[PDB]
A paper describes a structure:
Central to this ability are non‐canonical covalent intramolecular crosslinks between protein side chains forming isopeptide, thioester, and ester bonds that impart remarkable stability enhancement to single adhesin protein domains or are involved directly in covalent adhesion to host cells (Alegre‐Cebollada et al. 2010; Kang et al. 2007; Kang and Baker 2009; Kwon et al. 2014; Lei et al. 2021; Miller et al. 2018; Pointon et al. 2010; Walden et al. 2015). The autocalytic machinery of ester bond crosslinking, as first exemplified in the Clostridium perfringens adhesin Cpe0147, shows three residues (D577/H572/T450) arranged in space to mimic the acid/base/nucleophile catalytic triad of a serine protease, with Q580 the equivalent of a substrate electrophile (Kwon et al. 2014; Schwarz‐Linek and Banfield 2014). Two buried and protonated acids, D480 and E547, act like the oxyanion site of a serine protease, polarizing the carbonyl bond of Q580 side chain to increase its electrophilic potential and reactivity, and potentially stabilizing a high‐energy tetrahedral intermediate. In the proposed mechanism, H572 abstracts a proton from T450 Oγ1, which then effects nucleophilic attack on the Q580 Cδ with the loss of the side chain amino group as ammonia—the final state is the equivalent of the acyl‐intermediate of a serine protease mechanism, but without the potential to hydrolyze it is essentially trapped.
The replacement of the nucleophile threonine with a serine produces a crosslink species that is then hydrolysable at basic pH, and we have further proposed that this reaction follows the second half of a serine protease mechanism, whereby a water molecule attacks and breaks the ester bond of the acyl‐intermediate (Young et al. 2017). The T450S protein, similarly to T450C, closely resembles the wild type with an RMSD comparison of 0.66 Å across all Cα atoms. An intramolecular ester bond linking S450 and Q580 is unambiguously present. The pocket occupied by the T450 methyl group in the wild type or thiol in the T450C mutant is partly occupied by the buried acid E547, which, having rotated outwards from the wild‐type localization, no longer forms a proton shuttle with D480 and the ester bond carbonyl. Instead, E547 hydrogen bonds to an adjacent backbone carbonyl of V110 and stacks directly above the ester bond ether oxygen, making a close contact (E547 Oε1–S450 Oγ, 3.2 Å). The T450S structure instead shows the E547 side chain rotated out of the protein interior and stacking directly above the ester bond ether's oxygen (Ser‐450 Oγ). With respect to the mechanism of hydrolysis, as shown in the T450S crystal structure and reiterated by metadynamics simulations, the presence of the smaller serine relative to threonine considerably increases the likelihood of E547 directing its carboxyl group outward and close to the ether oxygen of the ester bond. T → S substitution enhances the ability of E547 to swing towards the ester bond to facilitate hydrolysis.
Numbering used by the authors: 446 to 587
The structure:
């Protein structure tokens, strides 16, 4: 299973090649932060707990949690599709970089890990890549 993500910051999307650039003007009333999560290789019609974390990237490369959103979601027809997380309006600061991390954990056991054809382990998929520009926003200087 995989998760991929796109941050949408004041209506500006991240991409693999370019962080979402949020103008200082846009940031003055806070930054509306949403995230769309493309999942593949999950189990069709099964419930997952989806956790998104908006991380502030500090000068030393360490991360601190700004916002967290947890939803209860269901995998599609064929175990693939898109979920969303709306973090709402966030008070993000000029010159700073923020990145969205995502985790999905099946509510039930979905994996047999000991060849007895009984399910014993949850499926866990994560995307925790602070270098993924598609998940990254930067607040620009005035
Ligand atoms: Ca704004
Ligand atoms: Ca088993």
């Amino acid at each position: 299973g995989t998760l991929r993500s796109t941050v949408i910051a004041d209506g500006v999307n991240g991409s693999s090649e370019k962080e979402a650039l949020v103008s200082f003007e846009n940031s003055k009333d806070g930054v509306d932060v949403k995230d769309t999560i493309n999942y593949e290789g999950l189990v069709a019609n099964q419930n997952y707990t989806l956790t998104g974390t908006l991380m502030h990237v500090k000068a030393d490369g360490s991360l601190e949690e700004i916002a967290t959103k947890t939803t209860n979601v269901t995998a599609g027809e064929n175990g693939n599709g898109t979920w969303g997380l709306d973090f709402g309006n966030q008070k993000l600061q000029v010159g700073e970089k923020y990145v969205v991390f995502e985790n999905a954990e099946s509510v039930e056991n979905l994996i047999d890990t000991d060849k007895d054809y009984n399910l014993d382990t949850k499926q866990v998929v994560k995307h925790e890549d602070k270098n993924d520009k598609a998940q990254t926003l930067v607040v620009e200087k005035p």
